[PDB]
Amino acid sequence: QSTYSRQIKQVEDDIQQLLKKINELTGIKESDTGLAPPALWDLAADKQTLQSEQPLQVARCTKIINADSEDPKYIINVKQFAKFVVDLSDQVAPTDIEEGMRVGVDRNKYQIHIPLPPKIDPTVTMMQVEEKPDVTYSDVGGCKEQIEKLREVVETPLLHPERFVNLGIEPPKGVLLFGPPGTGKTLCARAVANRTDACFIPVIGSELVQKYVGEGARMVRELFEMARTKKACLIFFDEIDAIGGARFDDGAGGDNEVQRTMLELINQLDGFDPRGNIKVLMATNRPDTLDPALMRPGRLDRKIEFSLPDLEGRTHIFKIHARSMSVERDIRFELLARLCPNSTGAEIRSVCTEAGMFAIRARRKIATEKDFLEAVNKVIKSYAKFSATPRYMTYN
Amino acid sequence: KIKENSEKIKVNKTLPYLVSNVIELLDVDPNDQEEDGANIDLDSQRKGKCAVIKTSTRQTYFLPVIGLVDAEKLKPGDLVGVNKDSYLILETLPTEYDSRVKAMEVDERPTEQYSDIGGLDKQIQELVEAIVLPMNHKEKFENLGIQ
Amino acid sequence: KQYEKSENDLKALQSVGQIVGEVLKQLTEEKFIVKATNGPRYVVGCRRQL
């Protein structure tokens, strides 16, 4: 026991001294080797080392014009923006490299070994992405009227296109979710996403805006296309007043950088092509910034307003939230909600959160009446004045 | 014999090779430019068909152009290859668009058929007349005499 | 024609490809200082023939 205790202190020095031997064998620092997958890969790996496949320099192929001296040549423009005419390394056919497609070329010997995967140039957009999140279903208010309306458009073609063709109905496209902050445009979208069980990419537009004008635009088209190719994709575009703002200039400023990207999104949704069956959802912070192209049916078939959750909604959010929580059940959860003024969805929940905290604070296996009264009287006075909604709603 | 003389050039001729563009096309004699006087009254300018080349690394290289595809074909805007290991013209390539432009080219859209796209009858006539007819039904337009 | 390529190309390989320059300033007409369009400035000679 006493012997065992001594080792706790010791192990830290012991790992530090040993550290050059650990580094070589397991990984990180001096001589990075994992030993488990690069070992297995080693025989294949030898082929690449021998060749000039290292380097294999980032590029995209402009045109595959072949010409004389060395016959299989391709005209490539690198991502840093200068063109090279290159050769084919025998390991693929001239068929594999195709005009407009992303391709790898060497820097020491300019020639294609293996073509580089096309359109995955944004890393910034990927940063935000978590596939299938949600706080928990209980905070939503569960099934609201708001959730059910959203499923008819959203869930149903992804889950079954079969039923769509059978009846003979065109498949939907766009749902525009709007309301001031905290009416839960994102919360409901996450809930339907999980249910349908389509792969889920949500992204903030604020990372599809980067560097100067036109670089952000390249990111939006390539991302969108990639999703479109993919069968049963759901894209929830989170908070766009960052690729979704007003269209003007006054020639003392200009909205341009924002409008280049916004317009690039709008164009792509249905396309100049019929439509796909892959769904787009847009969440906007203003209904006051939208231009008519976005609004046309077949890029936006029905407008759903998630603004200030409905008369039914205010009570469901408290009771379904209350259900989950250890709380008193001699108080009417609806009475607390009803008290709440012109409540944004975020605000109804704010009562539950504040109410529960007092209950946790005591460390009881329920809650008491007192915790609820202080919470609710506080919420009605202060919070409501200080919500998003008074300022935004008049504007909108 | 051609391969043998070419042999010193041939090592540089292979990979890597850059691409470049033609600042000027210089059409002169096939081999040996004029001779200058002074001490030794003989050549210093031996330039055959030649091109003054600006590379796209923002460097400028002078080189006598290959007798297989001469300077004369070459003009400003044309792509031409040039070898990195020693700046000779690897090849001649024709002028071509960016990758973005390749996306821009045809994709084609399918028919909604005139009858089948509901109403707006007066408008079917306006678009058909303006757009598709001058291209396809071109002879009637030539007969009208309009541009 | 191919034999022709080899000979005209031969002239360049002596230099290891010729480089464009322009007289940055005339100091004498025998030794000039030249600025290179590929980049750095040089002090260069001239031919006894030119």
From Swiss-Prot, chain A:
Record CDD domains: RecA-like_PAN_like
InterPro entries assigned to the protein according to its UniProt record, in alphabetical order: 26S_Proteasome_ATPase, AAA+_ATPase, AAA_lid_3, ATPase_AAA_core, ATPase_AAA_CS, NA-bd_OB-fold, P-loop_NTPase, PRS7-like_OB
GO molecular function: ATP binding; ATP hydrolysis activity; general transcription initiation factor binding; proteasome-activating activity; TBP-class protein binding
Cellular component, GO, one term: proteasome regulatory particle, base subcomplex
Keywords: Acetylation, ATP-binding, Cytoplasm, Nucleotide-binding, Phosphoprotein, Proteasome, Ubl conjugation
Keyword Nucleotide-binding listed: yes
Main location: cytoplasm
Binding site for ATP: G179, P180, P181, G182, T183, G184, K185, T186
Record family assignment: Belongs to the AAA ATPase family.
Record function comment: Component of the 26S proteasome, a multiprotein complex involved in the ATP-dependent degradation of ubiquitinated proteins. This complex plays a key role in the maintenance of protein homeostasis by removing misfolded or damaged proteins, which could impair cellular functions, and by removing proteins whose functions are no longer required. Therefore, the proteasome participates in numerous cellular processes, including cell cycle progression, apoptosis, or DNA damage repair.
Name assigned to this protein: 26S proteasome regulatory subunit 7
Organism: Rattus norvegicus
